[PDB]
Design an enzyme around this catalytic site. Structure first.
Site, mmCIF file in Angstrom:
data_model
loop_
_atom_site.group_PDB
_atom_site.id
_atom_site.type_symbol
_atom_site.label_atom_id
_atom_site.label_comp_id
_atom_site.label_asym_id
_atom_site.label_seq_id
_atom_site.Cartn_x
_atom_site.Cartn_y
_atom_site.Cartn_z
ATOM 1 N N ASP A 123 0.929 -1.147 0.006
ATOM 2 C CA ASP A 123 -0.076 0.023 -0.031
ATOM 3 C C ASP A 123 0.849 1.202 0.200
ATOM 4 O O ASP A 123 0.814 2.084 0.787
ATOM 5 C CB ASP A 123 -0.897 -0.157 1.299
ATOM 6 C CG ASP A 123 -2.175 1.164 1.011
ATOM 7 O OD1 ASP A 123 -2.496 1.206 -0.006
ATOM 8 O OD2 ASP A 123 -2.501 1.708 2.239
ATOM 9 N N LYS A 125 1.191 4.085 -1.321
ATOM 10 C CA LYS A 125 0.663 5.242 -1.973
ATOM 11 C C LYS A 125 1.533 6.429 -1.118
ATOM 12 O O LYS A 125 1.687 6.234 0.028
ATOM 13 C CB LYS A 125 -0.478 5.529 -1.984
ATOM 14 C CG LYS A 125 -1.412 5.307 -0.935
ATOM 15 C CD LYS A 125 -2.946 4.954 -0.954
ATOM 16 C CE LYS A 125 -3.687 4.834 0.265
ATOM 17 N NZ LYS A 125 -5.017 4.992 0.037
ATOM 18 N N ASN A 128 0.918 7.525 2.189
ATOM 19 C CA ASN A 128 1.464 6.796 3.521
ATOM 20 C C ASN A 128 2.756 6.969 3.622
ATOM 21 O O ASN A 128 3.705 6.323 4.442
ATOM 22 C CB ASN A 128 1.291 5.163 3.269
ATOM 23 C CG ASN A 128 -0.037 4.713 3.503
ATOM 24 O OD1 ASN A 128 -0.853 5.474 4.246
ATOM 25 N ND2 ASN A 128 -0.596 3.704 2.770
ATOM 26 N N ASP A 145 1.491 3.055 7.913
ATOM 27 C CA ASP A 145 0.370 2.204 7.641
ATOM 28 C C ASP A 145 0.668 0.785 7.058
ATOM 29 O O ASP A 145 0.391 0.742 5.558
ATOM 30 C CB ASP A 145 -0.524 2.885 6.821
ATOM 31 C CG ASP A 145 -2.172 2.261 6.498
ATOM 32 O OD1 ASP A 145 -2.351 1.029 7.154
ATOM 33 O OD2 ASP A 145 -3.189 2.670 5.825
ATOM 34 N N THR A 165 16.241 -20.066 1.021
ATOM 35 C CA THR A 165 15.224 -20.706 0.058
ATOM 36 C C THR A 165 15.520 -22.368 0.321
ATOM 37 O O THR A 165 14.974 -23.284 -0.420
ATOM 38 C CB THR A 165 15.427 -20.517 -1.454
ATOM 39 O OG1 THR A 165 15.514 -18.961 -1.578
ATOM 40 C CG2 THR A 165 14.291 -20.896 -2.224
#
Ligand code: NA
Length: 298
Positions: A123, A125, A128, A145, A165
């Site tokens: 998120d 953006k 944030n 956030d 891994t």
């Protein structure tokens, strides 16, 4: 017993699943932000564990306290008093390429750290990425956030990083984490594009339809030419084209952004003003429209 230690003041943000309020630590008079999350509507356990483990990063929002009274969880963090980074940078009429590179370095170093530990933000953006105060320097930047962020875990659910891994993870989720990490870089590419020109690469304003924004994102072409761009460095334009690559597989990683000449040779970049559009409120609306379009299937 949050209200035992803290006086609650006014809403800073309201959402469907939480309210964010200013609050004051009673014994010290210091101000904080509290995110009050409805436990019936959302489970904030992942978000709080990420903030606990990674909030000591200088450029990640720092957790100060947490409470649970049964119905609500109260997540107390430092209070952002410097506003939104992109909006403050767009309102600076003399902002330069060299300052843009210092800002992208600080944010991208922070995302390189998170991706290396197996955390994707998902998120990222502009709304944030915030300033904790009005000093204007790179140490005041905070990624905030983490309510959509995810920690990578193996088939048996143990917390993993993308280097270990040697325990089995379905290449399935390794590919999905690769995609979410590449979306984090694309979001940083949208941030950089807008910082350099004063307009957003895929939306003109808040009235763009989601279908026109998604058609631009899908074309894989955007302007790196003409009035506001022509004078920006070719190295900046090269970096932007590679962070916004339409193919998530060919997009630069955070590690490779940090090796780009525009970030490494910041000392050679121009310090005179960028030539940009001056419409910060229009950008706010274009950016909300762009992320509403993209997130409409959550
Ligand atoms: Na921090």
């Amino acid at each position: 017993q949050f209200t035992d230690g803290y006086e609650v003041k006014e809403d800073i943000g309201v959402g469907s699943y939480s309210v964010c309020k200013r609050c004051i630590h009673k014994a010290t008079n210091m101000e904080f932000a509290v995110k009050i999350i409805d436990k019936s509507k959302r489970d904030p356990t992942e978000e709080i564990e990420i903030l606990l483990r990674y909030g000591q990063h200088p450029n990640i929002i720092t957790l100060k306290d947490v409470y649970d009274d049964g119905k609500y969880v109260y997540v107390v963090t430092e209070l952002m008093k410097g506003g939104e980074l992109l909006d403050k940078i767009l309102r600076q009429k003399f902002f330069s390429e060299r300052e843009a590179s210092a800002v992208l370095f600080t944010i991208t170093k922070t995302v390189e750290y998170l991706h290396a530990q197996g955390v994707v933000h998902r998120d990222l953006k502009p709304s944030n990425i915030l300033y904790v105060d009005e000093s204007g320097n790179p140490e005041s930047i905070r990624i905030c956030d983490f309510g959509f962020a995810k920690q990578l875990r193996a088939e048996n659910g143990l917390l993993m990083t993308p280097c270990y891994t040697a325990n089995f993870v379905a290449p399935e989720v390794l590919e999905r984490q690769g995609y979410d990490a590449a979306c984090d870089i694309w979001s940083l590419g949208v941030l950089l594009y807008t910082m350099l020109t004063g307009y957003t690469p895929f939306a003109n304003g808040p009235d763009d339809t989601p279908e026109e924004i998604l058609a631009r994102i899908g074309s894989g072409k955007f302007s790196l030419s003409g009035g506001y761009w022509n004078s920006v460095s070719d190295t900046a334009k090269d970096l932007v084209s590679k962070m916004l690559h339409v193919d998530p597989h060919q997009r630069l990683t955070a590690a490779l952004v940090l090796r780009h000449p525009w970030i490494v040779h910041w000392d050679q970049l121009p310090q005179y003003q960028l030539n940009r559009q001056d419409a910060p409120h229009l950008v706010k609306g274009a950016m909300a429209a762009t992320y509403s379009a993209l997130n409409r299937n959550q």
